């Protein structure tokens, strides 16, 4: 009587389902980087044409 | 109840399926030859061509 059950202890009020929050999806993206050139070496002038 | 357990472990099987398909997607995006490289390809080739 105190816990509001039946004669055999079965609950008189149906327990709520408590539907979960459920998982979510994941995402990824691209990443870039930048660089410069190398020092220009003075070409040793040959004799050819 | 053993049938219920089998169904639940089927659920976790397909959940692992989704997990490693997402892993496949992310590693494919993390591969070396990718969209940034191919955009470099197309842009440089277009201009210089």
- Alpha-carbon distance of A44 to A12, in angstroms, equals 98
Q: Which residue of A has its CA nearest to B26?
A: A28
- The total of other beta-carbon atoms located within 10 Å of residue A31's CB is 7
Q: How far from each other are the two terminal CA atoms of chain B, in whole angstroms?
A: 69
Q: Report the residue from A26, A30, A32 with minimal CB separation from B22.
A: A26
What does the H/E/C string look like for chain B? CHHHHHHHHHHHHHHHHHHHHHHHHHHHHCCCCCHHHHHHHHHHHHHHC
Which approach determined this entry? cryo-EM
- Alpha-carbon distance of B5 to B11, in angstroms, equals 10
Resolution to 1 decimal place, in Å: 4.3
- How crowded is the C-beta side of A7, counted as CA atoms within 13 Å? 0
Tell me if B38 sits within 8 A of A42, measured CB to CB.
Answer: no
Hey, is the C-beta of B36 within 8 angstroms of any chain A C-beta? Answer: yes
B19 conformational bin, left if phi > 0, alpha if psi -120 to 50, beta if neither = alpha
Hey, is the C-beta of B29 within 8 angstroms of any chain A C-beta? Answer: yes
Q: Which residue of B has its CA nearest to A34?
A: B36
Beta-strand (E) ranges in A1-49?
none
DSSP code at position A39: P
- The total of other beta-carbon atoms located within 10 Å of residue B22's CB is 14
Tell me if B36 sits within 8 A of A32, measured CB to CB.
Answer: yes
CB contact under 8 A, A30 and B35: yes
């Amino acid at each position: 009587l105190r816990h509001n059950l039946s004669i055999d202890g079965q609950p008189l009020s149906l327990a709520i389902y408590a539907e979960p929050t459920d998982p979510k999806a994941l995402l990824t993206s691209m990443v870039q980087a930048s660089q410069g050139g190398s020092a220009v070496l003075p070409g040793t002038l040959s004799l050819y044409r | 109840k053993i049938r219920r357990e089998a169904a639940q472990m089927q659920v976790e099987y397909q959940e692992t399926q989704q997990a490693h398909t997402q892993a496949q997607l992310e590693l494919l995006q993390r591969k070396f030859t990718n969209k940034a490289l191919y955009s470099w390809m197309r842009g440089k080739l277009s201009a210089i061509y």
